[PDB]
């Protein structure tokens, strides 16, 4: 068929209990329309994976504020008092992972690797429940891959094949979650023709992109 679809169609991909990766650092790089659409769907019991919870009115915040998320996996939640409130309250589960570890877990999930050794978190609470290996006289935490049912991606430019480019600091997690999810939805700022994006400028090849939201 085609990868091009309206936002209204995206609601078809949402379901209860599903795990979703969302791009963006502090809301910068988050697909707004997809998130608003995810909120409009009314789906609950979500497990969201992202770098952070952004602010209350940005990023994955609105989803958390309106109580549609049961679990969060991220590296920072400080700028969203609601996340913390719900974490403390018990309404929502939160897993705080070192950023460099989290992104590598996502990449591993995406790159078909069974795990990786990192020195980050050794001797801390991060070590709890994890395997530790000694190599080269140094202790490493063995971190395991992360995957998801769905990925919500924002891109700058996007052609009809799904080749993506990104703008400034809006890139962050997006290129990695694109490989780590079963199905991928991209929300490009600009839709271009195939050939308009030079081969040496494309960051995320269209092969990993399943569906494209049109302008």
């Amino acid at each position: 068929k085609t990868k091009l679809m309206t936002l209204q169609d995206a609601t078809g991909f949402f379901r209860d209990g599903m795990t979703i990766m969302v791009g963006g650092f502090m809301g910068i790089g988050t697909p707004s329309r997809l998130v608003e659409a995810l909120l409009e769907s009314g789906v609950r019991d979500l497990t969201l994976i992202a770098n952070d919870t952004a602010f209350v009115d940005t990023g994955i915040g609105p989803l958390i504020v309106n109580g549609r998320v049961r679990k969060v996996i991220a590296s920072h939640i400080g700028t969203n008092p609601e996340t913390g409130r719900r974490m403390i309250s018990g309404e929502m589960d939160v897993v705080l992972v070192p950023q460099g570890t989290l992104i590598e877990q996502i990449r591993c999930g995406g790159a078909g690797l069974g795990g990786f050794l990192t020195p980050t978190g050794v001797g801390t609470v991060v070590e709890e429940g994890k395997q530790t290996l000694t190599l080269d006289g140094k202790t490493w935490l063995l971190e395991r891959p992360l995957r998801a049912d769905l990925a919500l991606i924002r891109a700058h430019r996007c052609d009809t094949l799904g080749n993506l480019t990104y703008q400034l600091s809006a890139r962050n997690f997006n290129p990695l979650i694109a490989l780590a999810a079963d199905i991928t939805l991209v929300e490009p700022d600009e839709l271009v023709e195939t050939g308009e994006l030079q081969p040496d400028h494309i960051v995320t090849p269209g092969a990993v992109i399943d569906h494209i939201i049109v302008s």
């Binding site: 650092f25 502090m26 809301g27 910068i28 790089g29 770098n51 952070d52 952004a54 602010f55 991220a74 590296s75 920072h76 939640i77 400080g78 700028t79 008092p81 913390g84 974490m87 403390i88 705080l96 070192p98 950023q99 460099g100 570890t101 992104i103 590598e104 996502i106 990449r107 990192t118 020195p119 980050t120 978190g121 050794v122 001797g123 801390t124 609470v125 991060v126 990104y166 703008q167 400034l168 600091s169 809006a170 890139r171 962050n172 997690f173 997006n174 290129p175 990695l176 960051v203």
Partner: protein, 213 residues
């Protein structure tokens, strides 16, 4: 002005051409006290090199704190995997971070205080294990008067045995081969005050306050 003297001293530690990471809070001030002839490149965790002040605000350009920033000529963008590949891979010559506690074993705690809401560690852990030089910029004592430079951190660690340099408005400490050394004392202060305001065990440099080549 304490924060400014700290920032000023840390700025003098950086070498020309260094790749530097400045944590949110006090360390960001270090960029405002770089000596003449010292040029550094600032790395931003959210994925770019060549961080700088705002010129014209851009929605897709912010710092690790999510606040609008800018870039200098020759800046480079990259994703988070690359970012922490750089950070963890030892391509950051120096990171300057704040601190809640530091101890004689060079352990660090600066991402959570027991009793207060947990904000998360972010990229602090990767930064302190990965950076070639870990500089901690911190006030000597807390606002309640409690010690922050201890024998052993009581708060949850960011990392263990990671700190190389501790800079306060009262003194400069260095961790060399496991041992903690008091290498500088601030003007208007003496060794006894630092000792009194410090629970950590440390040896004092014999050649304290002397010129070097």
């Amino acid at each position: 002005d304490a924060k400014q003297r700290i920032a000023r001293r840390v700025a003098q530690e950086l070498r020309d051409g260094d790749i530097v990471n400045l944590g949110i809070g006090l360390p960001t001030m270090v960029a405002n006290y770089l000596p003449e002839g010292i040029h550094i490149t600032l790395q931003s965790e959210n994925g770019f090199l060549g961080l700088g002040p705002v010129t014209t605000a851009h929605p897709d350009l912010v710092n690790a704190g999510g606040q609008p920033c800018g870039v200098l000529p020759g800046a480079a963008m990259f994703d988070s995997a690359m970012s922490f590949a750089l950070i963890r891979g030892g391509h950051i010559d120096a990171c300057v971070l704040g601190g809640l506690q530091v101890d004689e074993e060079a352990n660090l705690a600066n991402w959570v205080v027991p009793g207060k809401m947990v904000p998360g560690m972010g990229g602090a852990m990767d930064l302190v294990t990965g950076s070639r030089k870990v500089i901690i910029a911190m006030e000597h004592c807390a606002k309640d008067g409690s010690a922050k430079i201890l024998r052993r951190c009581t708060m949850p660690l960011t990392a263990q045995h990671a700190v190389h340099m501790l800079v306060t408005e009262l003194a400069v400490f260095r961790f060399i081969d496991g041992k903690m050394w008091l290498t500088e004392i601030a003007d208007g202060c003496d060794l006894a005050t630092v000792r009194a305001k410090t629970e950590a065990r440390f040896e004092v440099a014999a050649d304290l306050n002397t010129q070097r080549g």
